[PDB]
């Protein structure tokens, strides 16, 4: 386990786990949702998300420790099934290690220069969302404090933003309450199906 000071801002092309890598071990994170996974859309109105500022690489172990800290503060503040946290970020870039000393100069110079896979990190663009927590209206400050506790644990500088959208959907919270009732949006689990008007008439007849 090498420090995160030597694996930082992007200096290589993305090298994913594929047909040509074949040697990367398992990532640290395996799951990506921690809260009420079966939460409906009208249950938790708002969401606060965590916006990066530096074009950096976040490691999977950092994502692990941050989601554990955020989950722990959420279950100590609003308890189980009072929140829904989703790590938006998924690690795919495989960093490499060129290890030596396997106190001698008589084993290997820079002869075999290409390295073996060490672990998985995640290339993060400027403005790309790290995490997103949807909660009730009364849990506004708790999401702020949870992502603030994750802020001290991610490297680099990043900000927090309470979204204008209604949860994880791409539609506005101002338009949601006035527009899901009349015509368009129908809830489908935790996601929302948006229907256009360019359908067959059997869909409109199945509605109403």
């Amino acid at each position: 386990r090498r420090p995160a000071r030597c694996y930082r801002y992007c200096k290589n092309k993305p090298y994913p786990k594929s047909r040509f890598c074949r040697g990367v071990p398992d990532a640290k994170i395996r799951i990506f949702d921690l809260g009420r996974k079966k939460a409906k859309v009208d249950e938790f109105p708002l969401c606060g998300h965590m916006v990066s500022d530096e074009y950096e690489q976040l490691s999977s172990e950092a994502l692990e420790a941050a989601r554990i800290c955020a989950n722990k503060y959420m279950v100590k503040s609003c308890g189980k099934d009072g929140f829904h946290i989703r790590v938006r970020l998924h690690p795919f870039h495989v960093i490499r290690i060129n290890k030596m000393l396997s106190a001698d100069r008589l084993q290997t110079g820079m002869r075999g220069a290409f390295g073996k896979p060490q672990g998985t990190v995640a290339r993060v663009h400027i403005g790309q969302v790290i995490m997103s927590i949807r909660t009730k209206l009364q849990n506004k400050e708790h999401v702020i404090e949870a992502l603030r506790r994750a802020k001290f644990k991610f490297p680099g500088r990043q900000k927090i933003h309470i979204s204008k959208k209604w949860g994880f959907t791409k539609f506005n919270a101002d338009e949601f309450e006035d527009m899901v009732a009349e015509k368009r949006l129908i809830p489908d689990g935790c996601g929302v199906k948006y229907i256009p008007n360019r359908g067959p008439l059997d869909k409109w007849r199945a509605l109403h």
Binding site: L201, W204, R205, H208
Partner: protein, 294 residues
């Protein structure tokens, strides 16, 4: 619930071709039939297109340009009662007859009638058309089979033999004409002449008259509705070939106009389509208001 039938199949479906989806071309043989070698730069390559359809055969000569295909001459089977062959429009005799009419009409269009008489006395031999020095050269055309399987006895070869005896210098072999034996490699010109004149179906009409008069009246009906007897068929095609070779000029039809026209239904407009949708919306809302209460 089972299959993933058609999701992006329509979006990645490379359509083949208009004529291939209609099923009228192949293009793997058309790319070799049509395209002239480029040491000529303008010389058209003439193709006799012989298409057999139910009730009618079509014999044409065409070449190609970048805009489409240019047809110089064309002869049909429904024009044979103008030459004498009233009934039997798709027999091998009509194939030979349409090929002869096509060749005579092409040579009448080109003015090469007095020269290149061809094979007047129909014998069924291997009469290759030779060119004469000091005179305009022979017409070099090539066959088109289309999608028909060219086994021995196909009447596209009968139209070929009609064009060759009319005087079109088309290269051909004698091992796909009817009457060619398969085991013995020799060719039977008497059987080929018999099959041109149509004496085999004369023998089959004799067979039906001597075996089953009920079948002889069930099929072959229009024959005895006007008149068909085998000696008059043997004289009938013999006079029809002479009528073609004496008058191939193809008189046409006037066809001014008949100024009365409504058969097909035109399209409806965008506003009409949208108002159909609006009437459907209003009628469904009216039904949901009315029938749920009543």
């Amino acid at each position: 619930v089972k299959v993933v039938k058609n999701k992006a199949y329509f979006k990645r479906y490379q359509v083949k071709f208009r004529r291939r989806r209609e099923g009228k071309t192949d293009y793997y043989a058309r790319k070799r039939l049509v395209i002239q070698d480029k040491n000529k730069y303008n010389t058209p390559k003439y193709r006799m297109i012989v298409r057999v359809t139910n009730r009618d055969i079509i014999c044409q000569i065409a070449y190609a340009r970048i805009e489409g295909d240019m047809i110089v001459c064309a002869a049909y089977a429904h024009e044979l009662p103008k030459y004498g062959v009233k009934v039997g429009l798709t027999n091998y005799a009509a194939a030979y007859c349409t090929g002869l009419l096509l060749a005579r009409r092409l040579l009448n269009r080109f003015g090469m009638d007095k020269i290149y008489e061809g094979q007047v006395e129909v014998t069924g031999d291997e009469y290759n058309v030779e060119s004469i020095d000091g005179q305009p050269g022979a017409f070099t055309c090539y066959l088109d089979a289309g999608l028909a399987r060219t086994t021995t006895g196909n009447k596209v070869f009968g139209a070929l033999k009609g064009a060759v005896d009319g005087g079109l210098s088309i290269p051909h072999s004698t091992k796909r004409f009817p009457g060619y034996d398969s085991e013995s490699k020799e060719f039977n010109a008497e059987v080929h002449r018999k099959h041109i004149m149509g004496q085999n179906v004369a023998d089959y009409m004799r067979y039906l008259m001597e075996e089953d008069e009920d079948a002889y009246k069930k099929q072959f009906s229009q024959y005895i509705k006007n008149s068909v007897t085998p000696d008059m068929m043997e004289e009938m095609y013999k006079k029809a070939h002479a009528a073609i070779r004496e008058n191939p000029v193809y008189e046409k039809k006037p066809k001014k106009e008949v100024k009365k026209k409504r058969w097909n239904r035109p399209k409806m407009s965008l506003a009409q389509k949208k108002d159909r949708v609006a009437q459907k919306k209003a009628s469904f809302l009216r039904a949901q208001e009315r029938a749920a209460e009543s």
